[PDB]
Amino acid sequence: ESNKKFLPFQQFGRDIADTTDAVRDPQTLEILDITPCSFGGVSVITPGTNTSNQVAVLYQDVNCTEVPVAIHADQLTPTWRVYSTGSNVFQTRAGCLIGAEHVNNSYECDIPIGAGICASYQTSQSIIAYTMSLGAENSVAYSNNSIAIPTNFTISVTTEILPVSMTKTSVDCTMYICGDSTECSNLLLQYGSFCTQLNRALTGIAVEQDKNTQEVFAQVKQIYKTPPIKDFGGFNFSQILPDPSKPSKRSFIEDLLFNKVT
């Protein structure tokens, strides 16, 4: 039942997308609001299968008043065979989360869930969901005449990684579309320059990647070399300076890096 006051001549109330949203019933001239049957996305929360097989399920932006009455009678397009609802069904702003035990404790995010809810595989091992902690609380002992001065230090070598280039691909448009077919190529000729501007765009990308590496690395005019003796005040640099023994003069850390990405 609705209150959309149809005037006696109107029959089909309409929605922005031109889908009918209300209808006057032909037999009893009464108005009916038509709401699409409750639907949503189903996301699956899993710790990496190489660790465990038990998962949780998030029904997105769906009050799970509907989720049980839908599955226990099998109203689902998912149509599970092995599905189980616990008493641990839990409600978040992101939707209803089934199979993850609500936990009062708060830890750092592991698997984002949204609205400040984060899930993780934790202990009997099980899937838990909590309100992620923002970091350790810490009040600073501030006073109007107190200053805290360090008496020591730490030389910390952080590492930071940036992409620079990406594989210089190139698509042969006419062979991709029309592989070895003169007939299909003739048909393609009617589309004009649709197929050459793609090649031009990809060529632009590739030459740009060469430019990227040039800019990032070729910032030195001359190729310097460290002297034979490593008398740098006690600092050990053998770990990052190139090693003579390996075919491409790449240092140890460069070798690990080249062994990871592959």
Binding site: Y142, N144, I147
Partner: protein, 189 residues
């Protein structure tokens, strides 16, 4: 409700406000030194003398005028209050973002009311009027058009998101060099 969902942000506005409160409390009680190591308490007056010395003004200038800078700072904050609370357009840059996204979505939805050459823009209408051999062509025209519209929408979203990412990287840069420390870059902060 055409499959057009809006997922919630990960950090609720509460958690974000907690973050900014953290950055504020650190900046006040400790200075820039909480961006390097652990926060080191320091009287805020001496912090201000630090940051005066950081711009070529000897710190005695601060201490001998402390009341006067304090009043100018408080008055400036009040002016910011009023400048916001009166001028609506002050937040245009955020507002624009919202509108753009909203606008795009509207366009997307409106694109469901176009024939694209089909006999009708309503799928179930064709489903209820033609047999499959003929309804197939109409339906195909609708898919081709709706797919083209959806691809257009996604591409505009990709570009707008890249722009927003540029803006967020600049915002992160400003919070790093501008809140967590004092920047010598002219007119950057």
């Amino acid at each position: 409700f055409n499959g057009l969902t809006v997922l919630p942000p990960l950090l609720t506005d509460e958690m974000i406000a907690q973050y900014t409160s953290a950055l504020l409390a650190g900046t006040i009680t400790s200075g820039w030194t909480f961006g390097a190591g652990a926060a080191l308490q320091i009287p805020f007056a001496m912090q201000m003398a630090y940051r005066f010395n950081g711009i070529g003004v000897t710190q005695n200038v601060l201490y001998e005028n402390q009341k006067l800078i304090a009043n100018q700072f408080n008055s400036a904050i009040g002016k910011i209050q009023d400048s916001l609370s009166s001028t609506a357009s002050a937040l245009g840059k955020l507002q624009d973002v919202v509108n753009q996204n909203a606008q795009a979505l509207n366009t997307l939805v409106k694109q469901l009311s176009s024939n694209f050459g089909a006999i009708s823009s309503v799928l179930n209408d064709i489903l209820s009027r033609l047999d499959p051999p003929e309804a197939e062509v109409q339906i195909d025209r609708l898919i081709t058009g709706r797919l083209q519209s959806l691809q257009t929408y996604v591409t505009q979203q990709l570009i707008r998101a890249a722009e927003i990412r540029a803006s967020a990287n600049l915002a992160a840069t400003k919070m790093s060099e501008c809140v967590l420390g004092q920047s010598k870059r002219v007119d950057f902060c």
